[PDB]
Amino acid sequence: KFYVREPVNAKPNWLAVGLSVGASVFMWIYLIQTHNEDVLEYKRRNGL
């Protein structure tokens, strides 16, 4: 509206955003599961 050349980044790329947020939440879930598994295995292999 203000700009003559249509701003390249006029509206968010919903695709790129959804991918970024999904990757972030997946990464956090995977990391938490892995940490829990590592704790359990350390206890298992070292007799608690």
Partner: protein, 320 residues
């Protein structure tokens, strides 16, 4: 997607879009040669896009708000001041000439980008190729210094070779006495002080350099004043031109792609115009440049990038 190697592979081939009227015509002539009317009419009849002549405000008009900015941001060079005092000891003349050359370069890049993208043709009013006439005329009259001539030629050497020349040039020849008559009639208070010697130097530069140089590669047509009217005649000539001469013939998809990549990035286009050759006329001091830059980077809409200015009316920033 930004035009890149990926898009080129997947399609977007320029030769796929080029057509008969996809050309780069340049209308040229002395001051008040009636260039603008003929340019608009050729563009309209041939279905191409007309680019008004680049002014001191071209970049500002074509970017951001599209509103003319202040002169301090837009070059601090005044055509009216040039005419009032052409030998002013503040070096306005060569500042104006360099700014106009750079703006013509930007306009040429935009027109070439448009041609290579949409496939439509472009009509232009003078261009970087024809711009040296004004500098030569200033030097001959004695308004600018030989070092400034050197600087301009250097920048042209760095910039000009990259871009393809226009397909056809259409030069309107009008003698200096009638040029003066037309200028008097136009009646611009500051323009009326242009000297016959200056006009004749522009004409001499034109005829004795530009047309011989352009005819080597482009297709050059010359129309006198009486022929210039009735543009339909000029449109007919353009229609029945055959371009067997020029660098354009040897291009192909990949050369067009590299030219497109160069033009698309306006930074690379104007990079060499800012070569750090320390010539007092163009050189700015640190304090003045900093003041101008800080003032510019808080204008409405020019503080952040185009898409991220919340003041002007951009939103979704927290996601963009």
């Amino acid at each position: 997607l930004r035009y890149g190697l990926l898009a080129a592979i997947l399609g977007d081939k320029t030769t796929k879009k080029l057509h008969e009227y996809s050309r780069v015509i340049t209308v040229d002539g002395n001051i008040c040669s009636g260039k603008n009317k003929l340019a608009k009419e050729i563009a309209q009849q041939l279905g191409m896009k007309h680019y008004p002549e680049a002014g001191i405000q071209y970049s500002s008009t074509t970017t951001g708000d599209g509103r003319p900015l202040d002169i301090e941001f837009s070059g601090s060079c005044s055509l009216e001041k040039f005419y009032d005092d052409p030998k002013s000891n503040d070096g306005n003349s060569y500042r104006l000439q360099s700014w106009l050359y750079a703006s013509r370069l930007l306009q040429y890049a935009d027109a070439l980008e448009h041609l290579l993208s949409t496939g439509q043709g472009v009509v232009l009013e003078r261009s970087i190729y024809s711009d040296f006439v004004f500098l030569e005329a200033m030097y001959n009259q004695g308004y600018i210094r030989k070092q400034c001539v050197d600087h301009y030629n250097e920048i042209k050497r760095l910039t000009l070779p990259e871009y393809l020349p226009p397909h056809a040039v259409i030069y309107i020849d009008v003698p200096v006495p009638e040029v003066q008559s037309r200028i008097q009639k136009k009646g611009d208070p500051h323009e009326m002080k242009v000297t016959s010697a200056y006009l004749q130097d522009i004409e001499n530069a034109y005829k004795k350099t530009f047309l011989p140089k352009m005819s080597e590669m482009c297709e050059v047509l010359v129309y006198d004043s009486w022929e210039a009217e009735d543009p339909t005649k000029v449109v007919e000539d353009i229609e029945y031109l055959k371009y067997n001469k020029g660098p354009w013939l040897k291009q192909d998809d990949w050369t067009f792609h590299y030219l497109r990549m160069l033009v698309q990035d306006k930074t690379e286009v104007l990079n060499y115009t800012t070569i750090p050759v320390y010539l007092p006329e163009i050189t700015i001091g640190a304090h003045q440049g900093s003041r101008i830059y800080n003032s510019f980077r808080e204008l409405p809409g020019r503080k952040y990038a185009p898409g991220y200015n919340a003041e002007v009316g951009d939103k979704w920033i927290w996601l963009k």
